[PDB]
């Protein structure tokens, strides 16, 4: 069961930002509301937005920020990459311990999906290798991990792409992948399985006592990558084999032996079986998640 | 289309740790009462055949250490309602949400906040299986809930792990779901069925999301589909069910019975190398309300 983190510490930060005709979600941390800069655009302006120019025509009072029933007073505003930063007259009393992290493809986090500043649901997801999220007016929703009462914020939703997938940035406002906050013809590159996440998950099934998919073979890293890429799997790298090291030594299965198992699995299928609870190979669990 | 849990911060503010003797598990703290599974007072020995009436007669308040994180709560009274043990406490939880104690039917879904000894670890969406079990994740005493307009409707509290890896528990008034007891005795889940009405709502969710390949010009019968359904271990489809799907049929232009034809024709021939919304197994853990609520 993919669990998302408890959302409460992020609910306490979700606000509503409005600029003219446009509303979306912002993130209240101390005395700064963070949100996507395109809150300042019309639909028209999304074709070719000049963000410096649009922002220069704005005062603090053009930005209406409501945390629940209470309108917050914006006393300054500043663009950093594609994120807007509104200084407010009131540090958020509900501010958790928190840090900003940029995550890399394959890693997981929870998303607090909101609508106009009210949290609507939480879900667990992975950053796909093409830098998108297969997910679910949630602009400004944030993705995060919690580690011993400290929320590490890693993602903010910005755009929806033509194939029904989401693109966004870190909280320094820097996009993941080649995407811009422009309604252009940008499209997701070919998406591939997070191979290392399937192997960590295969080791999880050995931990919960299911060994039926194993075989007597082994493989080389190179021969594995050659087979697996023909099924559109991400290359496995020496650094992936290392990260899996602790799962290996715990189940006594060496990594390349599990690689051999996966190769056969892609060749055969499940033959009716399920492994953990699933009838397909799951790539949204990391080696850190399983342990 | 992702399964989504309700946000859990209103429930997080309610989780406490409850220890009696050497036993430790999770409690729910609403106003001046802490709720938790009664088998907290149980010894490894008594768990084979316990007389909860007796072993709680012999317990008094000081036997229950209740900690709200970095705060021990003073128990000032105890009582049992069915299989839930209720603890009056010195203080009343200021984070208590507006709430209702509710009991749900098989095939309804809800969100669980798993906790390890009073500290919430994570949250997932799940469904109450037709055999009254939860396929799920030191979680004992964790609760299930649905949120509607800032009202937490609690519907589940976890008691038992069953030998097949599933979970068994009660409503918040202490009544078990399914033929299970809170003793360490041989108990198993019945053969599980698929939640038909939830599979049909999930097929509707697919035509809304633009995957319409499984549709067929055909119409079938309540009776003749139900025979095709008993043979695949699916729950029978009733008229209240069809009524429940009328919204989604109106929105999509596909009558429930014509969607049933689609379902019956995919139960025999499969997807022939296609998939529904990126999945090849028939998801049965989304209710109608869940699909409407998300579309």
Curated annotation (Swiss-Prot), chain A:
Active site (catalytic residues): 38, 139
Location of the protein in the cell: Host cytoplasm; Host Golgi apparatus; Host nucleus
Effect of residue 87 to R: In strain: Beta/B.1.351
Topological region Cytoplasmic: 1-291
Self-association and partners: 3CL-PRO exists as monomer and homodimer. Only the homodimer shows catalytic activity. Interacts with host FBXO22; this interaction promotes the proteasomal degradation of nsp5.
Coiled-coil annotated spans: none
Protein name (Swiss-Prot/TrEMBL): 3C-like proteinase nsp5
Known regulation of activity: Inhibited by pyridone-containing alpha-ketoamides compounds 13a and 13b. In turn, alpha-ketoamide 13b (tert-butyl (1-((S)-1-(((S)-4-(benzylamino)-3,4-dioxo-1-((S)-2-oxopyrrolidin-3-yl)butan-2-yl)amino)-3-cyclopropyl-1-oxopropan-2-yl)-2-oxo-1,2-dihydropyridin-3-yl)carbamate) inhibits SARS-CoV-2 replication in human lung cells. Inhibited ex vivo by michael acceptor inhibitor N3. Inhibited ex vivo by compound 11a and 11b.
Cross-link Glycyl lysine isopeptide (Lys-Gly) (interchain with G-Cter in ubiquitin) mapped to chain: 2, 87
Reactions accelerated catalytically: TSAVLQ-|-SGFRK-NH2 and SGVTFQ-|-GKFKK the two peptides corresponding to the two self-cleavage sites of the SARS 3C-like proteinase are the two most reactive peptide substrates. The enzyme exhibits a strong preference for substrates containing Gln at P1 position and Leu at P2 position
Residues in Peptidase C30 domain copies: 1-291
Function comment: Cleaves the C-terminus of replicase polyprotein at 11 sites. Recognizes substrates containing the core sequence [ILMVF]-Q-|-[SGACN]. Cleaves and inactivates human TRMT1, preventing tRNA guanine(26)-dimethylation of tRNAs. May cleave human NLRP1 in lung epithelial cells, thereby activating the NLRP1 inflammasome pathway. May cleave human GSDMD, triggering alternative GSDME-mediated epithelial cell death upon activation of the NLRP1 inflammasome, which may enhance the release interleukins 1B, 6, 16 and 18. Also able to bind an ADP-ribose-1''-phosphate (ADRP).
From Swiss-Prot, chain B:
Catalytic reaction(s) noted: TSAVLQ-|-SGFRK-NH2 and SGVTFQ-|-GKFKK the two peptides corresponding to the two self-cleavage sites of the SARS 3C-like proteinase are the two most reactive peptide substrates. The enzyme exhibits a strong preference for substrates containing Gln at P1 position and Leu at P2 position
Positions in the Cytoplasmic compartment: 1-295
Means of activity regulation: Inhibited by pyridone-containing alpha-ketoamides compounds 13a and 13b. In turn, alpha-ketoamide 13b (tert-butyl (1-((S)-1-(((S)-4-(benzylamino)-3,4-dioxo-1-((S)-2-oxopyrrolidin-3-yl)butan-2-yl)amino)-3-cyclopropyl-1-oxopropan-2-yl)-2-oxo-1,2-dihydropyridin-3-yl)carbamate) inhibits SARS-CoV-2 replication in human lung cells. Inhibited ex vivo by michael acceptor inhibitor N3. Inhibited ex vivo by compound 11a and 11b.
Effect of residue 184 to A: Does not affect ability to cleave and inactivate human TRMT1
Crosslinked positions (Glycyl lysine isopeptide (Lys-Gly) (interchain with G-Cter in ubiquitin)): 3, 88
Outcome reported for the amino acid change (mutating residue 130 to H): In strain: Omicron/BA.1, Omicron/BA.2, Omicron/BA.2.12.1, Omicron/BA.2.75, Omicron/BA.4, Omicron/BA.5, Omicron/BQ.1.1, Omicron/XBB.1.5, Omicron/EG.5.1
Effect listed in the UniProt record for changing residue 200 to V: In strain: Zeta/P.2
Result of changing residue 88 to R: In strain: Beta/B.1.351
Subcellular location: Host cytoplasm; Host Golgi apparatus; Host nucleus
Enzyme active site: 39, 140
Superkingdom of the organism of origin: Viruses
Location of the Peptidase C30 domain: 1-295
Protein function: Cleaves the C-terminus of replicase polyprotein at 11 sites. Recognizes substrates containing the core sequence [ILMVF]-Q-|-[SGACN]. Cleaves and inactivates human TRMT1, preventing tRNA guanine(26)-dimethylation of tRNAs. May cleave human NLRP1 in lung epithelial cells, thereby activating the NLRP1 inflammasome pathway. May cleave human GSDMD, triggering alternative GSDME-mediated epithelial cell death upon activation of the NLRP1 inflammasome, which may enhance the release interleukins 1B, 6, 16 and 18. Also able to bind an ADP-ribose-1''-phosphate (ADRP).
Subunit structure: 3CL-PRO exists as monomer and homodimer. Only the homodimer shows catalytic activity. Interacts with host FBXO22; this interaction promotes the proteasomal degradation of nsp5.
Name under which the protein is recorded: 3C-like proteinase nsp5
Residues of the full protein shown: 3266 to 3563 of 4405
């Amino acid at each position: 069961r993919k669990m998302a983190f408890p959302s409460g510490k992020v609910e306490g930060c979700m606000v509503q930002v409005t600029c003219g005709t446009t509303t979306l979600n912002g993130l209240w941390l101390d005395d700064v509301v963070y949100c996507p800069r395109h809150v300042i655009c019309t639909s028209e302006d999304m074709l070719n937005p000049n963000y410096e120019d649009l922002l220069i025509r704005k005062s603090n009072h053009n930005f209406l920020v409501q945390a629940g029933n209470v309108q917050l007073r914006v006393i300054g505003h500043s663009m950093q990459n594609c994120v807007l930063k509104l200084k407010v007259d009131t540090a958020n009393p509900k501010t958790p311990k928190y840090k900003f992290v940029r995550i890399q493809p394959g890693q997981t986090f929870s998303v607090l999906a909101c609508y106009n500043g009210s949290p609507s649901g939480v879900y667990q997801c992975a950053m796909r290798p093409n830098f998108t999220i297969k997910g679910s007016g949630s602009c400004g929703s944030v993705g995060f991990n919690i580690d011993y009462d400290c929320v590490s914020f890693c993602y903010m939703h910005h755009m929806e792409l033509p194939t029904g997938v989401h693109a966004g940035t870190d909280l320094e406002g820097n996009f993941y992948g080649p995407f811009v906050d422009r309604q252009t013809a940008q499209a997701a590159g070919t998406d591939t399985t997070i191979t290392v996440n399937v192997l960590a998950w295969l080791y999880a099934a050995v931990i919960n006592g299911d060994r039926w998919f194993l075989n007597r073979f082994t493989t080389t890293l190179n021969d594995f990558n050659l087979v697996a890429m023909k099924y559109n799997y991400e290359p496995l790298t020496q650094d992936h084999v290392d990260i899996l090291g602790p799962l290996s030594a715990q189940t006594g299965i060496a990594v390349l032996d599990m690689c051999a198992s996966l190769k056969e699995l892609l060749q055969n299928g499940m033959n009716g079986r399920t492994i953990l609870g699933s009838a397909l190979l799951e790539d949204e669990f990391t080696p850190f998640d399983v342990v």
